[PDB]
Design an enzyme around this catalytic site. Structure first.
Site, mmCIF file in Angstrom:
data_model
loop_
_atom_site.group_PDB
_atom_site.id
_atom_site.type_symbol
_atom_site.label_atom_id
_atom_site.label_comp_id
_atom_site.label_asym_id
_atom_site.label_seq_id
_atom_site.Cartn_x
_atom_site.Cartn_y
_atom_site.Cartn_z
ATOM 1 N N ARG A 177 0.871 -1.213 0.000
ATOM 2 C CA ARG A 177 0.000 0.000 0.000
ATOM 3 C C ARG A 177 0.882 1.228 0.000
ATOM 4 O O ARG A 177 0.871 2.057 0.932
ATOM 5 C CB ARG A 177 -1.007 -0.045 1.113
ATOM 6 N N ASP A 242 2.499 -8.570 6.700
ATOM 7 C CA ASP A 242 1.424 -7.884 6.039
ATOM 8 C C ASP A 242 0.138 -8.577 5.797
ATOM 9 O O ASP A 242 -0.574 -7.998 4.856
ATOM 10 C CB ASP A 242 2.012 -7.038 4.868
ATOM 11 N N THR A 243 -0.109 -9.838 5.887
ATOM 12 C CA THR A 243 -1.338 -10.475 5.510
ATOM 13 C C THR A 243 -2.388 -10.842 6.501
ATOM 14 O O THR A 243 -3.564 -10.409 6.451
ATOM 15 C CB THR A 243 -1.097 -11.571 4.393
ATOM 16 N N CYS A 348 -0.545 -20.376 -2.088
ATOM 17 C CA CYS A 348 0.037 -19.977 -0.837
ATOM 18 C C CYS A 348 0.438 -21.194 0.035
ATOM 19 O O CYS A 348 -0.370 -21.937 0.555
ATOM 20 C CB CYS A 348 -0.886 -19.138 0.008
ATOM 21 N N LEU A 349 1.746 -21.208 0.270
ATOM 22 C CA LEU A 349 2.426 -22.175 1.134
ATOM 23 C C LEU A 349 2.114 -21.875 2.621
ATOM 24 O O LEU A 349 2.078 -22.845 3.420
ATOM 25 C CB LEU A 349 3.965 -21.920 0.902
ATOM 26 N N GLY A 350 1.883 -20.625 2.908
ATOM 27 C CA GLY A 350 1.649 -20.212 4.308
ATOM 28 C C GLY A 350 0.193 -20.186 4.709
ATOM 29 O O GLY A 350 -0.189 -19.576 5.712
HETATM 30 C C1 HEM Z 1 -4.431 -14.645 5.293
HETATM 31 C C2 HEM Z 1 -3.323 -14.410 4.708
HETATM 32 C C3 HEM Z 1 -2.743 -14.772 3.365
HETATM 33 C C4 HEM Z 1 -3.278 -14.648 2.132
HETATM 34 C C5 HEM Z 1 -4.696 -14.231 1.748
HETATM 35 C C6 HEM Z 1 -2.237 -14.960 1.144
HETATM 36 C C7 HEM Z 1 -2.446 -14.993 -0.197
HETATM 37 C C8 HEM Z 1 -1.497 -15.416 -1.077
HETATM 38 C C9 HEM Z 1 -1.642 -15.325 -2.543
HETATM 39 C C10 HEM Z 1 -2.940 -14.788 -3.189
HETATM 40 C C11 HEM Z 1 -0.573 -15.889 -3.076
HETATM 41 C C12 HEM Z 1 -0.171 -16.108 -4.550
HETATM 42 C C13 HEM Z 1 0.270 -14.801 -5.232
HETATM 43 C C14 HEM Z 1 0.446 -14.940 -6.720
HETATM 44 O O1 HEM Z 1 -0.044 -15.958 -7.238
HETATM 45 O O2 HEM Z 1 1.000 -13.912 -7.231
HETATM 46 C C15 HEM Z 1 0.324 -16.270 -2.015
HETATM 47 C C16 HEM Z 1 1.588 -16.806 -2.211
HETATM 48 C C17 HEM Z 1 2.502 -17.026 -1.186
HETATM 49 N N1 HEM Z 1 2.226 -16.944 0.147
HETATM 50 FE FE1 HEM Z 1 0.542 -16.323 1.027
HETATM 51 N N2 HEM Z 1 -1.083 -15.361 1.824
HETATM 52 C C18 HEM Z 1 -1.339 -15.159 3.165
HETATM 53 C C19 HEM Z 1 -0.429 -15.451 4.164
HETATM 54 C C20 HEM Z 1 0.854 -15.943 4.049
HETATM 55 C C21 HEM Z 1 1.773 -16.249 5.139
HETATM 56 C C22 HEM Z 1 1.414 -16.062 6.627
HETATM 57 C C23 HEM Z 1 2.903 -16.691 4.585
HETATM 58 C C24 HEM Z 1 4.196 -17.195 5.242
HETATM 59 C C25 HEM Z 1 5.070 -16.413 5.854
HETATM 60 C C26 HEM Z 1 2.743 -16.605 3.122
HETATM 61 C C27 HEM Z 1 3.609 -17.078 2.169
HETATM 62 C C28 HEM Z 1 3.419 -17.271 0.814
HETATM 63 C C29 HEM Z 1 4.353 -17.773 -0.130
HETATM 64 C C30 HEM Z 1 5.737 -18.377 0.234
HETATM 65 C C31 HEM Z 1 3.820 -17.641 -1.356
HETATM 66 C C32 HEM Z 1 4.365 -18.051 -2.726
HETATM 67 C C33 HEM Z 1 3.994 -19.435 -3.259
HETATM 68 C C34 HEM Z 1 4.586 -19.745 -4.625
HETATM 69 O O3 HEM Z 1 4.944 -18.752 -5.356
HETATM 70 O O4 HEM Z 1 4.715 -20.946 -4.886
HETATM 71 N N3 HEM Z 1 1.465 -16.194 2.850
HETATM 72 N N4 HEM Z 1 -0.301 -16.004 -0.809
HETATM 73 C C1 LIG Z 2 3.362 -8.857 -2.110
HETATM 74 C C2 LIG Z 2 4.272 -9.849 -1.753
HETATM 75 C C3 LIG Z 2 3.768 -10.966 -1.073
HETATM 76 C C4 LIG Z 2 2.444 -11.166 -0.905
HETATM 77 C C5 LIG Z 2 1.947 -12.360 -0.120
HETATM 78 C C6 LIG Z 2 2.065 -13.684 -0.357
HETATM 79 N N1 LIG Z 2 1.461 -14.345 0.619
HETATM 80 C C7 LIG Z 2 0.985 -13.555 1.451
HETATM 81 N N2 LIG Z 2 1.296 -12.254 1.052
HETATM 82 C C8 LIG Z 2 1.512 -10.199 -1.321
HETATM 83 C C9 LIG Z 2 1.990 -9.029 -1.971
#
Ligand code: HEM
Ligand SMILES: c1ccc(-c2cnc[nH]2)cc1
Length: 405
Positions: A177, A242-243, A348-350
């Site tokens: 943001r 941030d999420t 999303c792995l997380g």
């Molecule tokens: C409620 C919260 C969360 C939401 C809604 C969210 C949503 C997302 C989305 C939409 C993507 C894919 C982005 C793309 O396709 O450009 C993503 C990827 C990712 N997220 Fe999350 N995320 C959240 C929390 C987290 C947390 C807590 C972690 C871990 C610290 C995390 C780690 C990752 C990683 C490592 C990826 C990349 C996966 C890949 O490229 O194979 N996220 N997330």
């Molecule tokens: C920019 C970089 C990372 C992300 C994200 C991936 N998973 C959670 N947040 C969202 C925007």
């Protein structure tokens, strides 16, 4: 500030949406975006804001574009272009099959097994923060709980000092943001100036933290480079910082307004999981996109190689063709359709970490503070961007209605 319409764009597909400042902001963030789904808006539109880009407004399209890495590449996943260009986060800025090795590692750090291991701290910290809040009859949920909760668990996980939060959090806010105070490249660099000395240290003297596991990991038989590690760690930071932070505020704001929803969860706890999915559908908050790798004709619209398209993950579940009465939160929906944590190879792995933190927060908050509301005369403001947020959430409650556990 509207960019001149390129030639290949039918003027009838124009719809000037500013993802950084939607028009119905006051009404709420999800409601502001959902204007894209009114009867008047074609499925695939072009906005002149943020320098010109496509937006797919339907679940079916977003899912397809997501699956399709051949045409829609993650190489430049952020709008505006310069932001998408300046970002080199792994595995996010890569397509299969390259993507896959890096993902497997990231999974080591955040996957299921780590959550199972951290569960007791998660529960410990939530109980402790809540109990601490309870007698006060009032917080700033955003600052008092939604920030510390998810963040202190991440710092713990990554082996970083609590003292660095204020610093990191700002840099992270700048990326999702953007304020105007700093460009994306500057923001990226400073976060990077941060990690560098750290990765150096954990390559030399490894720990058990996530950074150490990343920094010393194997990818395609060889060892990850420092640059690659820097780049994964960057993503971990933003996701961690941030999420969930923003997710909890939207959810809590909802709960503070809907007594009946609070009650349902209080009496029929078996529903928490099902409610968690529904709030993830309704308070979805991530909007990123892809870059076209060539001229390609999608659902009858001609896309030019190099065109960026926003594929708002937030929008799939808010679509009426996917969910009846999308704006309505219903804990007993037979099917909750969403792409909150993405779709296709980049899921999303997380997500596991995130869900565990949501379920804990609901279960624990409701337990102690079952009855609460928004401060009389407080105006809640949302913010839009790659990840949307709540500015502040002033809650009030009668301490006499709480229960200490
Ligand atoms: C409620 C919260 C969360 C939401 C809604 C969210 C949503 C997302 C989305 C939409 C993507 C894919 C982005 C793309 O396709 O450009 C993503 C990827 C990712 N997220 Fe999350 N995320 C959240 C929390 C987290 C947390 C807590 C972690 C871990 C610290 C995390 C780690 C990752 C990683 C490592 C990826 C990349 C996966 C890949 O490229 O194979 N996220 N997330
Ligand atoms: C920019 C970089 C990372 C992300 C994200 C991936 N998973 C959670 N947040 C969202 C925007």
């Amino acid at each position: 500030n509207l960019a001149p319409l390129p030639p290949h764009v039918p003027e009838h597909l124009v719809f000037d949406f500013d993802m950084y400042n939607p028009s119905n902001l006051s009404a709420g963030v999800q409601e502001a975006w959902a204007v894209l789904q009114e009867s008047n808006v074609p499925d695939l539109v072009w906005t002149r804001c943020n320098g010109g880009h496509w937006i797919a407004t339907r679940g079916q399209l977003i899912r397809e574009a997501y699956e399709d890495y051949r045409h829609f590449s993650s190489e430049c996943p952020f709008i505006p272009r310069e932001a998408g260009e300046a970002y080199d986060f792994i595995p996010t800025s890569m397509d299969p099959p390259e993507q896959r090795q890096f993902r497997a590692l990231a999974n080591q750090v955040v996957g299921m097994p780590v959550v199972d291991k951290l569960e007791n701290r998660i529960q410990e910290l939530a109980c402790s923060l809540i109990e601490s809040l309870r007698p006060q009859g009032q917080c700033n949920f955003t600052e008092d709980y939604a920030e510390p909760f998810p963040i202190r668990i991440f710092m713990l996980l990554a082996g970083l000092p609590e003292e660095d939060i204020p610093h990191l959090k700002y840099l992270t806010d700048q990326m999702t943001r953007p304020d105007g105070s700093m460009t994306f490249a500057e923001a990226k660099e400073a976060l990077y100036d941060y990690l560098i000395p750290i990765i150096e240290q954990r390559r030399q003297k490894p720990g058990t933290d996530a950074i150490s596991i990343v920094a010393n990991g194997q990818v395609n038989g060889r060892p990850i480079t420092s640059d690659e590690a820097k780049r994964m760690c960057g993503l971990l930071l933003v996701g961690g910082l941030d999420t969930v932070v923003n997710f909890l505020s939207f959810s809590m704001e909802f709960l503070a307004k809907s007594p009946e929803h609070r009650q349902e969860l209080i009496e029929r706890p078996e529903r928490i999981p099902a409610a968690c999915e529904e709030l993830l559908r309704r308070f979805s908050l991530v909007a990123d996109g892809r870059i076209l790798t060539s001229d390609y004709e999608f659902h009858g619209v001609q896309l030019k190689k190099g065109d960026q398209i926003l594929l708002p993950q937030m929008l799939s579940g808010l679509d009426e063709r996917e969910n009846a009465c999308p704006m309505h939160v219903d804990f007993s929906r037979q099917k909750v359709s969403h792409t909150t944590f993405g779709h296709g190879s980049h899921l999303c792995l997380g997500q596991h970490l995130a869900r565990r933190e949501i379920i804990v927060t609901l279960k624990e908050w409701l337990t102690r503070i079952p009855d609460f509301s928004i401060a009389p005369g407080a105006q809640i403001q949302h913010k839009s961007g790659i990840v949307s947020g709540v500015q502040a959430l002033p809650l009030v409650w009668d301490p006499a209605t709480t229960k200490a556990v």
